Design a protein around this ligand. Structure first.
Ligand code: VO4
Ligand code: VO4
Lengths: 472, 481
């Protein structure tokens, strides 16, 4: 119920030596959707009356999605079906062991049993609902062969994105059902975070906390090299303080009336290492120091990204995490609120003076446990207890003036491919002996650095996802 | 095609491969291109063998990695109308249907559940002699050598045919990463779609394609590649020693200037077949890289270099080059038919004899220290494999659907990780990618999948202090000698 015992200005990202023309990568880390749920039906939409109309461009390449056979004779006890945009989607079961059970040894036929609201595990959306996401694929690059580095929920997902490893780790509560063979398989809260504890509405007295005990994440290396970087999350800014201790009680109500916490502590991977943490959610020492070294330790409210961007101090590496209601997670979020966040954010970055050297990556943390038909290949760590993977397949997009347009990359990626790109582009090696970065393919087939004409900005209506300063 | 077509418009010693600049310690790659077995058929049950009395015994070593193979669920509750089942050592396996379209039909939109329906042949005949064999798998009591290679070297369980379909697309994909553009004097028939070869037309530039040879067939159309290069073009340009070395390539006679390839062998089950299989010789589909009259090297010293042979050789020429310290930088080995692994006319035991004798002999040579041997297959026979293969970048192009079925892939080398399963996504053009990477060549053509293919470097450890040991086996059993 209470928190446990726990200035240097960087050169502008634009001046840094990089392997590619990309000077700024922005990773928009959304929640809880399988590849098939979002793109299985791409690029075919129902187009009923009164919903945003989607019509695919001629010669849209195909995705490894939901075929006639998968739609009509699914091995599961219920067939895939089209989810309504007007209803609030539930959250399915994304526990490590449950997801493996759904996969059922390759049969991929126990999702109703182990992903179960019931039956929504089989639901998919099309372009009438995930309109923006589908329009982004129509104009930029999509990968249909990207997987969670391990099976399991949101905390392994976040740790794998920034370290390519989900441990080694310890908890004061012991392993419980959170940790297996030193690797985090569920969602203990981060140790070094005031807002994990019962003093915050965003915290939980009965959620265990965990810390990483060996191996670095990417932040160690970006800080060391003087590369401007940050994790920017909705709700990170405390609503109040209670004697040194930060209180994160910010809440929003989603389109479907669900009020939820803005800040989700177990979605903040850098606060699992002591070195990369900002436990008191300290604001930047100044707007000028966003992305550099100071009391914030590279951990920020989402508001600070926009201050940096608008002040010509866009970081080299920015992770963007929506306020809860917009992160795309079932139950408390949904595709319409997510789309507003996605469209507003991506519109704003494209309008900025740094769009010309930017790559935006949309990737997910976990599948919610939702149906996807692909029996994921093994990772090099799959024989190690607590590191089973690869996990379920996820949406992955690259939005950039250097992105291939209306292009589907079939290259085998995992969450540590994002890590691989950062390492490749800024000249950093493998983060640790635990990391999957060493085995991950890069994302370069989603880019064309040789073409003369740039891929143009795509400005959309945040309320519909349909095609519609510099400063907002 | 009873007689050879007209071939239309009618010497340089390369430096020793050991003197060449390379990216890695590998100065010699040997690609042993076997036939017609899916990953699951050969390795789905790895590393668990039945070990019935009298059959060559396999136990797995401590810490053998797991493969993406046949689980309890796939074994007991398979989506197909018949469950996977263990094939015996003791019978001549049939050949299943590895046609481009039939294989796609087995996959059945991702259900992977129509193999009995489409992996078989609708044939009297097949029904009475072969029923159910599409679902058969072997274990270490049959494919003993191959399982022991995996136990001592590197195996990849995520390697696929570049396209769906049979042997010719596989061979073209291996050497070019593309199965066209191509044309046949006979038109498409069921051989070509959208100028890509989807079945087995014989090579145009090969005397032994035609009815004059028992290896040939009057009623089989020929085809040629009309645009785009293969790796041979680049190796020759660059003066890198290379060859394709195949059993039965040496003609048994000449009728005027026409080579006759009538060599035959009898397998262990009494099945007699042609040693030479023209539609397995990919370089003869390009005029530029062909040796249509099967001319011999000008001299042993010229094996791998430029002369009348144009880098196309009888298997016998490989051993000569090896024994005389002129091992090529790049060598493709193709067994005489009876030992190529293909159902119907070959089998695991004849194949195993070929593999063991070949690999023993390379390991015993002076250049093993700088060699990597790759074992990879051309096609799956249409045999069961559970993996719904991911798409290639050419999958929306008619005649180029892929990736096709998953195949066995091994790397045997003093530099190979030992008892290691690489899960990297490979396809047949990954072999091409390795050659290009190692010897400093770019993509072969705008048509090639090489540019989208991962390399095989996760199967090597060039940094470890102790070299991977030789594995000398008994060709009769595949057991350690
Ligand atoms: O681990 V989560 O329920 O925040 O997708
Ligand atoms: O297409 V082949 O039957 O020579 O494996």
């Amino acid at each position: 119920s209470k928190p446990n015992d726990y200035q240097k200005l960087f050169n502008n990202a634009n001046t840094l030596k990089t392997t590619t023309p990309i000077k700024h990568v922005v990773i928009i880390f959304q929640e809880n959707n399988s590849f098939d749920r979002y793109f299985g039906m791409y690029p075919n939409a129902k187009n009923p009356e009164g919903e945003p109309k989607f019509v695919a461009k001629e010669n849209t390449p195909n995705v490894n999605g939901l075929t006639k056979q998968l739609l009509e004779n699914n091995p599961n006890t219920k067939n895939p079906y089209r989810l309504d945009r007007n209803f609030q989607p539930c959250s399915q079961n994304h526990e490590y062991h449950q997801e493996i059970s759904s996969f059922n040894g390759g049969l991929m036929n126990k999702f109703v049993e182990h992903g179960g609201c019931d039956g929504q595990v089989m639901g998919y959306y099309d372009g009438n609902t995930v309109t923006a996401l589908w329009n982004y694929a129509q104009n930029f690059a999509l990968n249909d062969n990207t997987f969670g580095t391990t099976f399991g929920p949101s905390t392994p997902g976040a740790l794998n994105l920034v370290a390519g490893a989900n441990g080694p780790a310890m908890s004061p509560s012991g392993n419980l059902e959170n940790i297996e063979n030193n690797y985090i398989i569920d969602d203990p809260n981060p140790y070094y975070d005031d807002c994990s504890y019962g003093t915050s509405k965003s915290g939980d007295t009965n959620t265990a906390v965990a810390k990483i005990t060996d191996g670095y994440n990417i932040g160690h290396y970006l800080t060391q090299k003087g590369i401007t970087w940050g994790w920017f999350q909705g709700g990170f800014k405390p609503t109040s303080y209670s004697g040194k201790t930060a209180i994160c009680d910010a809440m929003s109500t989603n389109k479907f009336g669900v009020k939820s916490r803005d800040y989700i502590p177990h979605h903040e991977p850098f606060n699992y290492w002591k070195e990369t943490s900002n436990p008191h959610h300290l604001a930047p020492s100044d707007d000028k120091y966003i992305g550099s070294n100071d009391q914030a330790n590279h951990q920020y409210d989402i508001s600070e990204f926009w201050k940096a961007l608008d002040q010509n101090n866009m970081p080299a590496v920015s992770y963007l995490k929506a306020p809860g209601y917009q992160d795309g997670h079932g139950g408390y979020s949904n595709p319409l609120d997510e789309q507003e966040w996605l469209v507003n954010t991506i519109n704003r970055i494209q309008q900025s003076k740094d769009w010309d050297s930017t790559a935006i990556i949309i990737i997910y943390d976990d599948s919610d446990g939702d149906y996807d038909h692909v029996y994921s290949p093994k990772s090099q760590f799959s024989d190690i207890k607590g590191r089973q993977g690869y996990g379920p397949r996820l949406p992955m997009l690259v939005i950039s003036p250097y992105a291939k347009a209306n292009y589907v990359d079939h290259s085998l990626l995992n969450q540590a491919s994002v890590l691989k790109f950062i390492e490749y582009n800024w000249g950093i090696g493998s983060v640790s002996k635990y990391s999957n970065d060493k085995y991950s393919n890069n994302i370069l087939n989603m880019f064309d650095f040789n073409k003369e004409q740039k891929t143009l900005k795509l400005i959309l209506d945040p309320k519909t996802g349909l095609v519609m300063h510099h400063h907002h």
